Each structure stands twice: as structure tokens, then as C-alpha cells.
């Protein structure tokens, strides 16, 4: 977090990028600034993704532990069922 | 399995895959569209962000 | 044990090797559609016969 | 309608109508307007004769009624009960309750 | 069910195997040990048999004793055979 200190879109930028529902890309700009850019855009996302992946972590109050969904062994197959999920039902707790 | 690096690729579907899957382009969507739907690709890097 | 129209193997739910096997079994009947059993060989027995 | 013994005994079981009537779409319905497919086989008895568990619901509540409608949390066909491990998540890939 | 004492699978097992909400089996196994193998799978039997036979013990709280299934003698019979259910009435002795 700090010190890089904060994307301001400019070039430097930083990776984590731990916001969410950021109104700041657009928002103003205005625009960008003289720099060489190219990533820039890959660090862009890459860090995107997982401020939303991260910004999940609660969520998982109401969620649920994913499952195989697929699956494989599973090393014992050999007394009991081994299957998985389709997702086609809600997780809410309430 | 493993998806791994040593171990090689493998087909997901049985041969009948290629047989279905050219039948249906090749027919069931041109005689539908009669020639109007185009083939394109995509633009990832435009996509994903 | 059982019969069996028509079903999904090019696969995405079910399983192998615990509760199902081939038969061709009791003649009049046409099944086309069984491409899935058991596996570690050759190309022989879908597109030589 | 049966005690003890040792062998109890001979004569026709049911007998001679149910054969040729029941077993009598056998030759009669399925694979043509089919176009056949229907697919017999024989089994051998393990993933429901050795291996079909778990056990975690609580009782259907205490003391009342049993209507229909599908809605919200607490139960098992609820996930509550299903992750993978039982009968439950197995049981809704479609929609419907129990 | 002291001692023998857990089923952890392992091949001792023990023949009952009285528990409920089992996330054992898996669980991990992980996988099962350096041992022949065979059965296990009929100890497992009687026992996972045991496991919920036994834990019946309530559900008889809102049963619905069974019925004759069917009828034959039915020691009168002489002025009084019988049917047994099919109940169709949602049984929860409220």
C-alpha cells in the first residue's frame, strides 16, 4: 500500500491495486500522461483480477467451500462414491 | 489428471467430435444462415480487461 | 442388470470404473453410440471395423 | 405369509399368464420410430450394493405438516447438506426438492 | 465402541461403525495404507448397515407401525383376513 503510494494513472503503477468498484478509471484521467506505456496494461489486469478475487474474501460467509465440481481419485474410490457438482443452486445462508 | 508439463496432450472427445462437429458446421448453420454469418476472431487483450 | 438409450460421454458429469460395462446384447436393437470403456493402446476398433 | 421350515415347496409359481403378455413388448415397443436406442447390459453390483453414504440432516422438524413450494436455507437437499457426500448435491443438476 | 477405536482406514476396521454425519470416508485417506485389502469392504458392511439401523432410534416418534404388507392367515382368517397399507397419508403423528 504504501509507499508507491496510489494509481494515478501516470505509468508507474503499482501491482496490488487492492480497490474495488473503482469509479477512478473513468473518473478523470485527463488524460494520460508522457510516458513509453505497453505494461501498463498487463500489470493493469493482472493486479485487477485479483483486487476483485480479493475482493470477494468476505462473500464467503454465505458461500460454501467449492467442491471438485469434476472430480478425480479422491485415493479411496474403493468403498465409496467419488462424483461432483454442477453449480445450478444458490449459496446464501440467509 | 495432472495437467503437469511432462505429460502429454490427449483429445478431450472421442473421434465422433470431429464427425458431429463438421456435420453441424458444414449444414445445420449454413442452411440456416444461407450465407450471411461471417467467421471472425476475437480480440483478447481488448476483451478481458 | 440394465438397458440404456442415449446418454453423455465427450464428458462432463459421470463417471468410470465402478458401475457400468459394455454388452451388445440381445439381437434387435441398433445402438450406434457407446464410444467410451477402457483405456491404454492403439487407434483399432472405431475407424478399422 | 411365510414361517420357518427348511425347503418350502413345490409347485408353479405365478404360473402361465404373466409370461407371454408382459415380457410381450419383447418383441413389442421401442427402437425404431426409435431408430433403436435403447442399450441393454448386465452388471456387477458395486456403486449401490458396497458404497451408497452420509448421514448428517437433521429430523424432518418436529411434530407437523409436509407441504410442496422449493424456497430457502435450512435443510438436506439444501446444501446444508450438500457439497459432495451424501445423496444430496448428487441429487439437483435439474429443479425440484424432497 | 472402545476400544477398536476409530475407523480411519486403515483395513482393522472395527465391524460397527456407529456414527452419523461421517465426513470421513472423506475426509482424507489419504489414501488408504500399506495393507492387503479385500474386506474392509463386508466389515463394512454390517457396520455402515449398524450405522443407521441403529440410528433410527427416533422417527419412531412420528411413525406409523408398519402393517401386515399384505394379508394371508392372519391366525382367524374365519370371519377376519385383512389388507395390509399402502398409506398414502403424509405419516408425522403431528
Not at chain 1, 55 to 62: E, G, L, M, P, S
Not at chain 2, 18 to 32: D, M, Q, R, T
Request: proline letters at 9%; aromatic letters at 10%.
Amino acid at each position: 500500500s504504501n509507499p508507491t503510494t496510489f494509481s494515478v494513472e501516470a505509468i508507474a503503477a503499482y501491482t496490488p491495486v487492492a480497490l474495488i468498484r473503482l469509479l477512478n478509471a473513468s473518473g478523470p484521467l485527463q488524460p494520460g500522461h508522457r510516458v513509453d506505456i505497453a505494461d501498463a496494461r498487463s500489470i493493469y489486469t493482472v493486479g485487477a483480477a485479483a483486487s476483485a478475487a480479493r475482493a470477494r474474501a468476505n462473500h464467503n460467509a454465505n458461500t460454501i467451500r467449492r467442491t471438485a465440481m469434476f472430480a478425480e481419485t479422491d485415493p479411496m474410490t474403493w468403498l465409496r462414491p467419488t462424483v461432483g457438482l454442477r453449480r445450478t443452486f444458490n449459496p446464501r445462508i440467509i | 489428471g495432472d495437467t503437469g508439463q511432462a505429460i502429454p496432450i490427449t483429445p478431450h472427445h472421442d473421434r465422433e467430435w470431429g464427425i458431429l462437429s463438421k456435420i453441424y458446421y458444414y449444414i445445420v448453420i449454413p442452411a440456416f444462415s444461407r450465407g450471411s454469418c461471417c467467421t471472425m476472431g476475437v480480440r483478447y487483450d481488448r476483451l478481458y480487461p | 442388470g440394465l438397458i440404456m438409450m442415449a446418454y453423455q460421454a465427450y464428458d462432463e458429469t459421470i463417471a468410470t470404473g465402478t458401475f457400468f460395462y459394455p454388452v451388445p446384447v440381445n439381437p434387435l436393437f441398433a445402438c450406434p453410440e457407446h464410444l467410451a470403456s477402457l483405456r491404454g493402446m492403439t487407434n483399432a476398433r472405431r475407424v478399422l471395423a | 405369509r411365510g414361517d420357518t421350515g427348511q425347503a418350502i415347496p413345490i409347485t408353479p409359481h405365478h404360473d402361465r399368464e404373466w409370461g407371454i403378455l408382459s415380457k410381450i413388448y419383447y418383441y413389442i415397443v421401442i427402437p425404431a420410430f426409435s431408430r433403436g436406442s435403447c442399450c441393454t447390459m448386465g452388471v456387477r453390483y458395486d456403486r449401490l450394493y458396497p458404497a451408497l453414504q452420509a448421514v448428517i440432516v437433521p429430523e424432518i422438524p418436529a411434530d407437523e405438516e409436509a407441504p410442496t413450494t422449493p424456497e430457502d436455507p435450512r435443510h438436506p437437499l439444501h446444501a446444508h447438506q450438500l457439497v459432495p457426500n451424501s445423496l444430496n448435491v448428487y441429487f439437483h443438476n435439474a429443479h425440484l426438492t424432497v
